[PDB]
Amino acid sequence: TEFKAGSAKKGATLFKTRCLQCHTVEKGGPHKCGPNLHGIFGRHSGQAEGYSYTDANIKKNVLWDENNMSEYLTNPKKYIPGTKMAFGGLKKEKDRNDLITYLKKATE
Amino acid sequence: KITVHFINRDGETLTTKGKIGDSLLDVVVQNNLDIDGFGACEGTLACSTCHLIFEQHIFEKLEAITDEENDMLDCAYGLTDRSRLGCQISLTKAMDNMTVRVP
Numbered sequence: 001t002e003f004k005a006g007s008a009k010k011g012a013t014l015f016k017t018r019c020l021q022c023h024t025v026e027k028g029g030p031h032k033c034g035p036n037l038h039g040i041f042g043r044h045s046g047q048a049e050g051y052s053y054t055d056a057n058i059k060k061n062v063l064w065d066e067n068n069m070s071e072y073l074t075n076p077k078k079y080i081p082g083t084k085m086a087f088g089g090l091k092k093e094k095d096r097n098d099l100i101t102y103l104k105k106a107t108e
Numbered sequence: 109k110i111t112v113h114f115i116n117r118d119g120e121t122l123t124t125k126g127k128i129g130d131s132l133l134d135v136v137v138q139n140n141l142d143i144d145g146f147g148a149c150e151g152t153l154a155c156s157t158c159h160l161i162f163e164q165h166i167f168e169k170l171e172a173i174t175d176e177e178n179d180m181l182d183c184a185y186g187l188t189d190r191s192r193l194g195c196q197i198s199l200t201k202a203m204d205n206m207t208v209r210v211p
């Protein structure tokens with residue numbers, strides 16, 4: 001790709017410190033501020049039921065792959081202008097590789 | 109300085125003082141109020157933990173809500189018609205002795 005595997009353990013702690021405030025990853029996990037992300041890989045943006053997405057996310061219709069996800073995480077608002085996800089971004093590719101490695105695994 | 113009362117989620121009333129111009133997050137942070145998780149993003153509109161529920165007469169004269177606050181506020185738990193993000197609300201004369209509720 002333009003994405004390579006990292007440390008899932010490192011990625012777990014990245015999740016906890018940077019994403020857990022708003023999201024769950026487990027199957028049967030609830031929506032919070034943000035939507036539960038189980039099964040995100042391969043699904044298009046805006047399709048978790050019971051969550052109120054912005055117009056912007058839905059119409060962006062991103063197919064979530066480890067690769068898209070990387071560009072998204074760099075700068076969410078640059079990627080989906082108008083998203084209400086209030087997260088600045090993960091500028092280091094190594095951080096993103098770690099986190100996505102952990103998401104790839106925990107969201108299946 | 110003015111008195112502000114906070115009804116915490118446990119039901120305990122926290123009575124404290126802040127200076128006019130201070131945000132409600134400033135009030136919580138400086139006085140070490142025991143409100144679990146309050147002020148997570150340290151007032152940058154990236155969290156909903158500073159959500160407070162205001163008295164109606166206070167609420168109606170608050171500064172116009174910005175789109176940025178609204179997007180974050182939309183995600184808060186226990187939203188009411190008198191809800192604002194506290195880190196955006198600064199103390200005014202009219203708030204002396206007011207009560208806010210932590211949902």
Ligand code: HEC
Nearest residue numbers: 018019022033034045046053054057083084085086087154
């Ligand atoms: C301050 C809360 C917040 C944080 C922190 C946050 N998100 Fe989000 N996230 C949201 C919200 C709100 C949405 C919904 C966006 C909308 O509808 O525009 C979102 C949407 C998402 C989406 C799109 C989901 C879909 O079904 O299309 C992904 C992927 C995502 N977040 C991943 C994460 C990851 C991974 C992190 C950790 C770096 C993270 N987010 C950090 C709030 C947050």
Ligand code: FES
Nearest residue numbers: 149151153158195
């Ligand atoms: S402290 Fe996070 S938005 Fe108020």
